[PDB]
Amino acid sequence: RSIPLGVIHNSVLQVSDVDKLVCRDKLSSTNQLRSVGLNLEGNGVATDVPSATKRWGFRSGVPPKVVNYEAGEWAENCYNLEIKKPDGSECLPAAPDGIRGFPRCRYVHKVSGTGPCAGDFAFHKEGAFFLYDRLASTVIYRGTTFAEGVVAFLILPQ
Amino acid sequence: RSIPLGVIHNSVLQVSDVDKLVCRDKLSSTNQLRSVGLNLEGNGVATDVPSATKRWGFRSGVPPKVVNYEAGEWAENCYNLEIKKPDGSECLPAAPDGIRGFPRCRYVHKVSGTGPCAGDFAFHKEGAFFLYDRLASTVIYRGTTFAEGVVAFLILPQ
Amino acid sequence: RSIPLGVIHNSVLQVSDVDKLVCRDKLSSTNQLRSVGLNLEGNGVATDVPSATKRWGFRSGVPPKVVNYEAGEWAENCYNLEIKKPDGSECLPAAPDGIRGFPRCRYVHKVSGTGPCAGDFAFHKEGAFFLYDRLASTVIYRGTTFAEGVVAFLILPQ
Amino acid sequence: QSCVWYGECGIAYGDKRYNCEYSGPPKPLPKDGYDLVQELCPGFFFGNVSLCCDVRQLQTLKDNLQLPLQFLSRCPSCFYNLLNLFCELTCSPRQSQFLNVTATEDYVDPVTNQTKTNVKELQYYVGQSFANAMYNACRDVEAPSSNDKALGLLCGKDADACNATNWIEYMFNKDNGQAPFTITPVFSDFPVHGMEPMNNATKGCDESVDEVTAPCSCQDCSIVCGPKPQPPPPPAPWTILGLDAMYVIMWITYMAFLLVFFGAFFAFEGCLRRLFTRWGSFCVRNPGCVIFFSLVFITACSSGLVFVRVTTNPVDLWSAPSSQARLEKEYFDQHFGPFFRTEQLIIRAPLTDKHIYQPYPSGADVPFGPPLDIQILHQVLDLQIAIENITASYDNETVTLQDICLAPLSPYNTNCTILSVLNYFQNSHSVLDHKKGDDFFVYADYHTHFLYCVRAPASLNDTSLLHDPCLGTFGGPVFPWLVLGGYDDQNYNNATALVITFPVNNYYNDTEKLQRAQAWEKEFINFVKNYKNPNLTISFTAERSIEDELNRESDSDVFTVVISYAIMFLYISLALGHMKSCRRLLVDSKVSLGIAGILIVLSSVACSLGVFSYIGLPLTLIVIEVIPFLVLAVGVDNIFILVQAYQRDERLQGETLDQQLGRVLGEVAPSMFLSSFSETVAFFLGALSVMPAVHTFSLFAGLAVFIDFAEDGTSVQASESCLFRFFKNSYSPLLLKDWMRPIVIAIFVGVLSFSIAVLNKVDIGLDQSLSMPDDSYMVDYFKSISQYLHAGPPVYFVLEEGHDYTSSKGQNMVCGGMGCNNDSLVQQIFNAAQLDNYTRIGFAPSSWIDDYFDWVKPQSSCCRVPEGKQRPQGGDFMRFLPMFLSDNPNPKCGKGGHAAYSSAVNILLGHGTRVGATYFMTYHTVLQTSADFIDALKKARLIASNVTETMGINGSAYRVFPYSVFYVFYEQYLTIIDDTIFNLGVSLGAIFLVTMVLLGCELWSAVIMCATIAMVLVNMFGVMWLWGISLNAVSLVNLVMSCGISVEFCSHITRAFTVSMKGSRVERAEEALAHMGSSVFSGITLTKFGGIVVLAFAKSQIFQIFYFRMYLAMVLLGATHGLIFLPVLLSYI
Ligand SMILES: *[C@@H]1O[C@H](CO)[C@@H](O[C@@H]2O[C@H](CO)[C@@H](O[C@@H]3O[C@H](CO[C@H]4O[C@H](CO)[C@@H](O)[C@H](O)[C@@H]4O)[C@@H](O)[C@H](O)[C@@H]3O)[C@H](O)[C@H]2NC(C)=O)[C@H](O)[C@H]1NC(C)=O
Ligand SMILES: *[C@@H]1O[C@H](CO)[C@@H](O[C@@H]2O[C@H](CO)[C@@H](O[C@@H]3O[C@H](CO)[C@@H](O)[C@H](O)[C@@H]3O)[C@H](O)[C@H]2NC(C)=O)[C@H](O)[C@H]1NC(C)=O
Ligand SMILES: *[C@@H]1O[C@H](CO)[C@@H](O[C@@H]2O[C@H](CO)[C@@H](O)[C@H](O)[C@H]2NC(C)=O)[C@H](O)[C@H]1NC(C)=O
Ligand SMILES: *[C@@H]1O[C@H](CO)[C@@H](O[C@@H]2O[C@H](CO)[C@@H](O)[C@H](O)[C@H]2NC(C)=O)[C@H](O)[C@H]1NC(C)=O
Ligand SMILES: *[C@@H]1O[C@H](CO)[C@@H](O[C@@H]2O[C@H](CO)[C@@H](O)[C@H](O)[C@H]2NC(C)=O)[C@H](O)[C@H]1NC(C)=O
Ligand SMILES: *[C@@H]1O[C@H](CO)[C@@H](O[C@@H]2O[C@H](CO)[C@@H](O)[C@H](O)[C@H]2NC(C)=O)[C@H](O)[C@H]1NC(C)=O
Ligand SMILES: *[C@@H]1O[C@H](CO)[C@@H](O)[C@H](O)[C@H]1NC(C)=O
Ligand SMILES: *[C@@H]1O[C@H](CO)[C@@H](O)[C@H](O)[C@H]1NC(C)=O
Ligand SMILES: *[C@@H]1O[C@H](CO)[C@@H](O)[C@H](O)[C@H]1NC(C)=O
Ligand SMILES: *[C@@H]1O[C@H](CO)[C@@H](O)[C@H](O)[C@H]1NC(C)=O
Ligand SMILES: *[C@@H]1O[C@H](CO)[C@@H](O)[C@H](O)[C@H]1NC(C)=O
Ligand SMILES: *[C@@H]1O[C@H](CO)[C@@H](O)[C@H](O)[C@H]1NC(C)=O
Ligand SMILES: *[C@@H]1O[C@H](CO)[C@@H](O)[C@H](O)[C@H]1NC(C)=O
Ligand SMILES: *[C@@H]1O[C@H](CO)[C@@H](O)[C@H](O)[C@H]1NC(C)=O
């Protein structure tokens, strides 16, 4: 029931927390705290949209959640989805105010069409996040470029 | 001009604050801080809607306010109101994003009709809050189940 | 890369920060921290709308930002703008929820018409803020009274 | 008496000063301030003019009046009380009673270091009643052009928040950036701690400030408003006529029934003349030369008199001369001659949408119609500039618009006169493209100026930030009604059409210059016709369109009638002589009548259009009667031939009949000497009638005889057929035609009621060519503007008091006009007026001005005045001085410098008493119909009478004159009622008298023929006012000819039936008509057979589609009645 906090010296990455942070460990400014978004792509992670959707699914009853992150990495593949329900209305919610596309994509799978939309929101089946511009959401937003990813919290040197 | 903070040992509830919190009182984690919502119902508090509305009133010029709370109690009676103005438009504002009905109600007075709506927002005349799902508002939202209540802030043992 | 913090004794305004705050300087409560909005008007500043607009301009690609402030001053001149694009749609965004007009204006230049609107948002060319009711924005909102101004952060005596 | 200040001290802010503290008595104002005090605070201008202000303060007060004037100038009472509030503060010798200094600071003279004291703030005790009355007088004043109250601009808040005391509080607060220092007002009708509030008398907006300053308007005030108009009259009868007809019918029916019941219960002179004729023939029957020789003589007289086929037809002279119509037109000339003509275009933008535009600083939504889109205005300006540049050639010379245009300010300004919305921008693309704006607002553009200029088109300076003039480049204002169409009320912004108007010289007296102008017009019409722009639909005024269309269209149809005329003369040729015996005659007969007519007219000079359809169709009378006399003889055959066989068959039926036919015809065309615009064509034909009569006399008979003695077989058969027909007719009459005869009477009755209970003047509807159509369509669509002038010439003008009285007449005329309306707007005038009496008045209160000589030379300014006391007197009366100055103008004098002159006056030397002729004109739109304009003219005459009837004098001396490009042209459609009644009446007497010149049966013949007069007329009227009919200068002539041919018919049937030797009940009648019936089917039938080719045929215009239309219908009805009428009369007898 506690979010891990990474502590780095020169290159010592020890997964600690304040449930350990030795009385010699120095946190002198809040500027030393950073959150980072890392991408989930590479070998064994399919890139084409038909294979990619297998990692996501529609679900109702679960409210979407957002968390900020301050830095991330260049993504080789990003996604940008637009989906009409069978009756023609919109399947994905509009991007909330201040949520912009993931800012550094080599390539964007930007696609549009219609589908069954069997739920209120599209989630990540592996429990990862959809990374937008320094905001990570549990959910896919309409016409908005994302990378798949996860977040870590760090203490940086002075 | 200061919000009271409740301090509990085993069963000692002393209404203190940090304007007293003895140098032997232990706050070692932010996880020890909890806000709680308690219900205002029982003897002398009428339950039928015509009698219940007497505790509320419409007012303009006052912006609604929301505050979170983390735990509350089962309510015997909840309310869920929908009201058209005489011209047919909506009298109560739609529930803002992320505001859901009070989660534990034995019984919901769920009613709908039309009324005079002589103000922008419906408030509590006794200065209590309308409790929704872990959010307390000064105001009634359309079609959204609430319990009437008040909030306290506590320091829990380690 | 650091926001200045003003420290006052009786009348000693020393622009310090916690990058200096002597080990004899007393911050015993968060109630001692105040943010203040100060107005930019007076000699030289175009008090008339044709001269005043020269300080503002339309720009796209830059997301608006808001910051609160807790106290400000009476303004001799305020502004309240409404602008239609050539095609008749709205040029300025509606005031977001909870953003009300600057509360203390001797006089409001309240004007309406149509204009070229060559950008998504209207900004301050001198890098100042548009002051609303205890919120300062980088941007002009439709039909909402503002004063031009800047913000400071202070530590007040106990 | 004591002051609180005197003179100016230090700077407060900007260019603004505090006054110097001073607590002594008031000081007599130096004489060098007397002009200022008279102008600003005349209430103080008496005695030693002892005041608590100096000249500097008064100058400062004047200089600061600009913004109050900006918004309140239009309502003098409102401005007056405000000025008095400031005068009392600034200058009152009792200041200390109502002012209390509340703050001061030192003033140091920079050179002497002597200290004085700035009055920094003071408190001003203002009457409560004064403040409320000041507000009351101003609260309805409307900003110069704006649905907003002027107080919204002078109160630091909107007008709905402005009150009396907060208005004064605002004006007096230095924070407003105008007041040099703050004055704190205290409002009380009661003394306050010994202070006596300023409670000067005030003027309401419904009151005059003085003798030369009128109350405020309705638009800018409330008190002096209402009431609207309530003089609408509603008439509507007619049912009465229907009832009467019905009643008559019922009566007839009853009579018939009664008749049925009964049947169930039970001359010498003429002879002598004939004999003489016969004798002559017998003599003549001894030589052909004589006859032909006479024909030859006629060949010459006819052709001879036709010398110089100068038979003119143009231009617009048919209303006839003399009388008032012409005399009135001539008069207006000697005073100015031809006011002029206009080439006018209506322009719409069919592919353009309306648009909105907020005008600073209001920001209210103002929609602008399609043609006021900025780009379409630029495109319309290019059209306009191109029109100005059009040239035509005439001989070897070049004709420009500048040679022929009204250029009111020549030579100093050759600028032509173009009434157009583009002249609000001085016909400049750049000027219109301008637009003072920044990153925030557009403060001024092509919209602001427009909304200002429609309210102040003479302005030489927009009040907005543009500061552009409204005045057109020709030196005068362009009134918005005259350049826009299809807008509601006075919301000129909602216009759906632009109107562009170029006045050009009509050159009525100069033939060589008019031809040049007409050459230019032709190029103008061509330019407009071929102008390509999908964004604009352009449609016509010019001159040829109306003159070229009639002369261009009226041609093709000619081939129609011409053809019909040939096919008809062919039959009439085959009929009798068939072979080449009768043909010759006719051709000569028709030629004789036509040729003789032209000759008879050449001896007096004359010509015309319809004068042809009458000449040709009229010739029928000669052929008809001539075609029956020969046919009758053909049916002859007894113990004689040539000798007595010709005199016994000619001087027997041709003597009486012809003798009576010739007279009845000459009486209709002869007495045609009446008063109107048709006597020419008429008489000429009537004269040609006796001629044609005397011609076929021995010419036809002799020729027919001299030569008359397969073809034979054909003739016999025709004769046989005729005989058979006659027999049939007799049989029909034998049975009983009492029932049908009564029915016929009913038809005539119903016709009289239906024809007498309708009517109409005459409109203009030419073929569907193009140009004409455009003008017609545009006029129908447009509205509000486009004009004619009502105009008066007046004499004398020397008695200041009579001029005042004439001005009251003039002002009263402007009222009624701006009131009299119909449907959803006014009909009478327009309307409004700009004589000059107002110009003089303006000058009296105005200044001088600069005149810049052309091409170069030093500036000249010269003038003076004459106030204060004198000012009021000068304006009130005397006029030589004013007149001689006012005629010479071309540069305003005040805030700008433009042109505001005119004309109409022309005295000699400095004899101002001999001034003529002032002329006021209010242009009113109509373009509804021939009856519409005629109705408006009817009203204007009564208007002229009312004005002249109000206050006259001595015998005669000029009067009202309504000269509108529609009068003289419609002036005829006026006395049309008397004409028809008089024209036909004259014929009724000549016919009844003629038919008696050889009979006189009292009621017999008299009634017989007389009955034919009203018998046929009812038919002509019915068809005219009944079905596809009409009426006008022609239709009137049409009715005349109708009565003519009608007389012809009746004449023959009756002159041989009335007599009846062996007399009987109804047997003898059937016998006579028999020998007369054969001819009734010959000429008549044929004549109709010809019209059909003309009527039943086709054409390329409704013009003749009607003229020759009724002809056949009216001519047919008359013919039918001939047989029936006679039969019915015989029965009656
Ligand atoms: C007959 O009509 C003519 C035009 O139809 C009159 O001359 C025209 O005058 C206008 C106004 O100047 C010319 O427009 C141009 O003006 C600019 C400069 O703009 C100035 O505007 C005003 C004064 O003009 C001033 O306040 C500003 O400071 C600017 O200086 C010039 O640069 C152009 O050359 C041009 O003159 C028209 O071009 C001009 N038309 C012609 C055909 O020259 C003329 O005055 C009229 N005649 C009489 C007797 O009134
Ligand atoms: C023709 O011109 C007339 C003006 O005589 C136009 O009437 C105008 O209509 C507008 C609405 O389009 C009125 O403004 C209104 O203001 C209220 C409150 O500010 C607002 O709620 C409305 O939406 C509207 O903007 C304006 O007052 C009114 N002008 C007058 C005369 O009072 C008319 O719309 C034009 N229509 C044609 C002939 O095309
Ligand atoms: C304010 O009212 C006073 C009183 O009526 C005016 O003073 C009079 O002015 C008339 C006109 O010149 C004189 O005949 C009187 O003799 C004046 N009477 C007094 C008592 O002075 C005064 O003119 C008004 N003020 C203004 C600015 O018009
Ligand atoms: C109209 O003018 C009156 C003063 O003559 C203004 O007066 C006061 O009204 C305001 C509210 O608008 C109150 O707060 C003040 O206390 C009032 N003062 C007094 C002495 O009465 C009034 O406000 C003005 N109203 C408008 C629409 O302009
Ligand atoms: C008719 O109107 C159109 C629209 O104003 C004119 O065409 C042009 O419009 C295009 C598209 O907006 C612009 O890019 C051009 O600037 C316009 N043309 C020019 C030459 O500037 C068109 O010219 C008009 N037709 C005529 C005959 O004037
Ligand atoms: C039109 O009149 C306006 C009046 O406001 C003039 O604008 C200013 O007039 C004031 C006089 O009170 C001058 O002191 C200013 O210099 C004028 N403005 C400017 C820009 O100088 C304006 O000059 C007039 N213009 C014309 C062409 O008549
Ligand atoms: C001013 O003139 C008045 C009469 O108009 C006279 O009574 C008074 O004495 C004069 N005062 C002075 C100082 O001239
Ligand atoms: C003027 O009025 C003020 C109060 O507003 C008072 O204090 C002062 O003494 C008065 N002065 C005179 C000369 O009346
Ligand atoms: C008077 O003014 C002069 C400047 O002209 C200055 O030199 C001098 O010091 C001043 N003296 C007084 C009386 O203050
Ligand atoms: C002026 O005000 C009075 C009362 O103060 C009112 O009776 C009158 O109607 C007003 N003037 C107008 C509106 O004509
Ligand atoms: C007509 O023109 C001639 C000169 O060509 C002139 O003498 C005469 O006065 C003019 N007529 C009028 C009515 O002005
Ligand atoms: C006007 O005519 C002149 C002839 O000199 C020509 O040069 C010019 O192009 C024309 N301008 C137009 C077509 O408006
Ligand atoms: C035009 O007329 C002039 C005389 O006015 C003559 O000299 C010239 O040759 C003529 N030119 C033409 C083309 O007729
Ligand atoms: C003409 O004026 C008289 C009064 O002189 C008036 O009675 C009548 O109504 C007016 N008629 C018209 C048509 O103006």
**Concatenated DSSP letters of D494-548:** G-SEEEEEEEE---TT-HHHHHHHHHHHHHHHHHHHH---TT-EEE---SHHHHH
Beta strand A33-39 pairing with A147-155: antiparallel
* Residue C113 to residue D441, Cβ atoms within 8 A: yes
DSSP state of B71: B
DSSP state of D569: H
- Residues in chain D within 8 Å Cβ distance of C112: 358, 363
What are φ and ψ of residue D565, in 5° steps? -60, -40
Select the residue from D175, D357, D440 to test the C interface by mutation, using most C Cβ atoms within 10 A: D440
| CA D358 – CA D205 distance, rounded (Å) | 32
| CA D118 – CA D420 distance, rounded (Å) | 56
State the virtual CA torsion across D225, D228, D231, D235 in degrees, nearest 10. -170
- Under 8 Å between Cβ of C121 and C59: yes
**D111 Cα: distance to centroid of ligand 9 (angstroms):** 8
| CA B74 – CA B104 distance, rounded (Å) | 5
State the virtual CA torsion across C81, C84, C85, C88 in degrees, nearest 10. 170
| CA D698 – CA D290 distance, rounded (Å) | 10
* Residue C54 to residue D438, Cβ atoms within 8 A: yes
| CA D1005 – CA D1056 distance, rounded (Å) | 11
Q: How close D423 gets to chain C, by Cα (Å)? A: 26
CA D936 → CA C6, D786, D924, distances in Å? 86, 15, 9
Chains in contact with A, where contact requires at least 3 CB pairs less than 8 Å apart: none
- Under 8 Å between Cβ of D688 and D623: no
Looking from the CA of residue D195, the nearest atom of ligand 8 is 14
Q: What are the tokens at D37?
A: 């005090």
Q: What are the tokens at D973?
A: 């459609």
Query: Residues of D near C (CB-CB distance < 8 A)?
Result: 156, 356-361, 363, 438-443
- Under 8 Å between Cβ of A32 and A158: yes
Give me the total of CB pairs closer than 8 Å, taking one residue from chain C and one from chain D. Answer: 43
- Under 8 Å between Cβ of D813 and D834: no
Q: Residue D372's CB: how many other CB atoms inside 10 A? A: 26
- Residue-wise over D933-961: b if at least 16 C-beta within 10 A, else e? bbbbbebbeebbeebbeeeeeeeeeebbb
Q: How close D868 gets to chain C, by Cα (Å)? A: 41
**D480 Cα: distance to centroid of ligand 6 (angstroms):** 26
* Residue D441 to residue C53, Cβ atoms within 8 A: yes
- Under 8 Å between Cβ of D780 and D926: no
Range list of H helices, chain A = 49-52
**B43 Cα: distance to centroid of ligand 1 (angstroms):** 92
Is D821 among the annotated ligand-binding positions?
no
Q: What are the tokens at A79?
A: 């996604």
Q: Residue A135's CB: how many other CB atoms inside 10 A? A: 19
Asked if chain C contacts chain D via 3 or more Cβ pairs within 8 Å, the reply is yes
- Residues in chain C within 8 Å Cβ distance of D360: 111, 113
Asked if chain D contacts chain B via 3 or more Cβ pairs within 8 Å, the reply is no
The alpha-carbon radius of gyration of chain A (Å, integer) is: 18
- Under 8 Å between Cβ of B91 and B155: no
Place of tokens 């085959």: D574
- Under 8 Å between Cβ of B5 and B154: yes
State the virtual CA torsion across D236, D241, D246, D248 in degrees, nearest 10. 160
CA D534 → CA A15, A17, B66, D348, D349, distances in Å? 78, 78, 62, 11, 9
CA D81 → CA D41, D78, D133, D134, D207, distances in Å? 11, 6, 8, 6, 12
Strand-pair partners of D485: D497
- Under 8 Å between Cβ of D97 and D196: yes
| CA D226 – CA D249 distance, rounded (Å) | 54
Q: What are the tokens at A68?
A: 């900020």
Q: Which residue among C49, C88, C107 sits closest to D441, beta carbon to beta carbon?
A: C49
- Under 8 Å between Cβ of D216 and D203: no
- Under 8 Å between Cβ of D184 and D122: yes
Measured by CA distance, the residue closest to atom 3 of ligand 8 is: D100
Q: Which helix (H) or strand (E) holds A38?
A: strand A33-39
Measured by CA distance, the residue closest to atom 8 of ligand 11 is: D509
Ligand number with the minimum distance to the CA of D335: 11
Is D533 among the annotated ligand-binding positions?
no
C46 touches chain D (CB under 8 A): no
Burial, D476: exposed, middle or buried (Cβ in 10 Å; 0-12, 13-18, 19+)? buried
Place of tokens 């928040």: D161
Strand-pair partners of D11: D17
State the virtual CA torsion across D671, D675, D677, D681 in degrees, nearest 10. 10
Q: How does DSSP assign D327-344, residue by residue?
A: HHHHHHHHHHS---EEEE
Q: Residue D367's CB: how many other CB atoms inside 10 A? A: 12
What amino acid occupies position A26?
K
To one decimal, the resolution in angstroms is 6.6
Place of tokens 């991330």: A72
Q: Which of D422, D447, D467 is nearest to D360 (CA)?
A: D447
Alpha carbons within 13 angstroms on the beta-carbon side of residue D660 total 31
Dihedral sign, CA of D278, D283, D287, D291? negative
Q: Is D386 in the pocket of ligand 12 (CB under 6 A)?
A: yes
Place of tokens 């500027």: A31
Q: Which helix (H) or strand (E) holds B79?
A: strand B75-84
- Under 8 Å between Cβ of D52 and D5: yes
Q: Which of A77, A74, A10 is nearest to A38 (CA)?
A: A74
Q: Which helix (H) or strand (E) holds D1050?
A: helix D1033-1055
Which residues have a C–N gap over 2.5 Å right after them in chain C? none
What are φ and ψ of residue D804, in 5° steps? -60, -45
Q: Is D337 in the pocket of ligand 11 (CB under 6 A)?
A: yes
- Under 8 Å between Cβ of D134 and D74: no
DSSP state of A146: B
| CA B89 – CA D220 distance, rounded (Å) | 42
Q: Is D338 in the pocket of ligand 11 (CB under 6 A)?
A: no
**D366: closest chain C residue by CA:** C113
Cα angle value D772/D778/D781 (rounded, 5°): 140
- Under 8 Å between Cβ of C79 and C145: yes
At a CB cut-off of 8 Å and minimum separation 6, what does D711 contact? D578, D579
Burial, D816: exposed, middle or buried (Cβ in 10 Å; 0-12, 13-18, 19+)? middle
In chain B, the N- to C-terminal Cα span, in Å, equals 29
Q: How close C107 gets to chain D, by Cα (Å)? A: 9
Q: 3-class DSSP state for residue B5? A: strand
- Residues in chain C within 8 Å Cβ distance of D361: 111
Q: Which of D611, D784, D576, D753 is nearest to D681 (CA)?
A: D611
Q: What are the tokens at C136?
A: 């300062």
Burial, D854: exposed, middle or buried (Cβ in 10 Å; 0-12, 13-18, 19+)? exposed
At a CB cut-off of 8 Å and minimum separation 6, what does D371 contact? D347, D348, D349, D352, D377, D380, D495, D496, D497, D498
| CA A95 – CA A139 distance, rounded (Å) | 10
Residue C157 CA to its chain's centroid (Å): 25
What amino acid occupies position D509?
N
What amino acid occupies position D863?
C
- Under 8 Å between Cβ of D219 and D150: no
- Under 8 Å between Cβ of D991 and D1013: yes
Q: Is D165 in the pocket of ligand 4 (CB under 6 A)?
A: yes
- Under 8 Å between Cβ of D1106 and D1030: yes
What amino acid occupies position D792?
G
Q: What are the tokens at D166?
A: 């907060």
Q: Which helix (H) or strand (E) holds D168?
A: helix D164-171
Looking from the CA of residue D532, the nearest atom of ligand 5 is 27
| CA D536 – CA A55 distance, rounded (Å) | 63
C27 touches chain D (CB under 8 A): no
DSSP state of D961: B
| CA D274 – CA D281 distance, rounded (Å) | 11
Residue A1 CA to its chain's centroid (Å): 21
Q: What are the tokens at D955?
A: 């015998």
Q: Residue D670's CB: how many other CB atoms inside 10 A? A: 17
Q: Is the N-terminal amide bond of D917 cis, ω within 30° of 0? A: yes
| CA A149 – CA A138 distance, rounded (Å) | 10
Experiment used for this model: cryo-EM
| CA C71 – CA C135 distance, rounded (Å) | 10
Residue D635 CA to its chain's centroid (Å): 61
Dihedral sign, CA of D841, D842, D846, D849? negative
- Under 8 Å between Cβ of D539 and D346: yes
Q: What are the tokens at D717?
A: 């058969």
For B12, left (φ over 0), alpha (ψ -120 to 50), or beta?
Answer: beta
At a CB cut-off of 8 Å and minimum separation 6, what does D263 contact? none
At a CB cut-off of 8 Å and minimum separation 6, what does D124 contact? D89, D98, D99, D172, D183, D184, D185, D186, D198
- Residues in chain C within 8 Å Cβ distance of D152: none
Chains in contact with C, where contact requires at least 3 CB pairs less than 8 Å apart: D
Place of tokens 């059209």: D383
State the virtual CA torsion across D967, D971, D973, D976 in degrees, nearest 10. 170
Place of tokens 């000693």: C12
Q: Is D942 in the pocket of ligand 14 (CB under 6 A)?
A: yes
DSSP state of B140: P
Q: Is D413 in the pocket of ligand 1 (CB under 6 A)?
A: yes
Q: Which of D544, D540, D538 is nearest to D383 (CA)?
A: D538
**D1127 Cα: distance to centroid of ligand 10 (angstroms):** 85
Alpha carbons within 13 angstroms on the beta-carbon side of residue B27 total 15
For D322, left (φ over 0), alpha (ψ -120 to 50), or beta?
Answer: left
Select the residue from C41, C47, C49, C146 to test the D interface by mutation, using most D Cβ atoms within 10 A: C49
| CA A71 – CA C36 distance, rounded (Å) | 31
Q: How long a stretch of residues is chain B?
A: 158
What are φ and ψ of residue D940, in 5° steps? -65, -35
| CA A26 – CA A17 distance, rounded (Å) | 13
Q: Is D428 in the pocket of ligand 8 (CB under 6 A)?
A: no
C127 touches chain D (CB under 8 A): no
Looking from the CA of residue D369, the nearest atom of ligand 2 is 39
- Under 8 Å between Cβ of D494 and D367: yes
- Residue-wise over D524-547: b if at least 16 C-beta within 10 A, else e? bbeebeeeeeebbebbbbbbbbbe
| CA D143 – CA D149 distance, rounded (Å) | 6
- Residues in chain C within 8 Å Cβ distance of D174: none
Q: Which helix (H) or strand (E) holds D646?
A: helix D643-650
Q: Which residue among C53, C84, C112 sits closest to D439, beta carbon to beta carbon?
A: C53
Place of tokens 């009298």: B91
Q: 3-class DSSP state for residue D125? A: strand
The residue to mutate among D387, D388, D389, D427, having the most atoms of ligand 12 within 8 angstroms of its beta carbon, is: D389
- Under 8 Å between Cβ of A60 and A119: yes
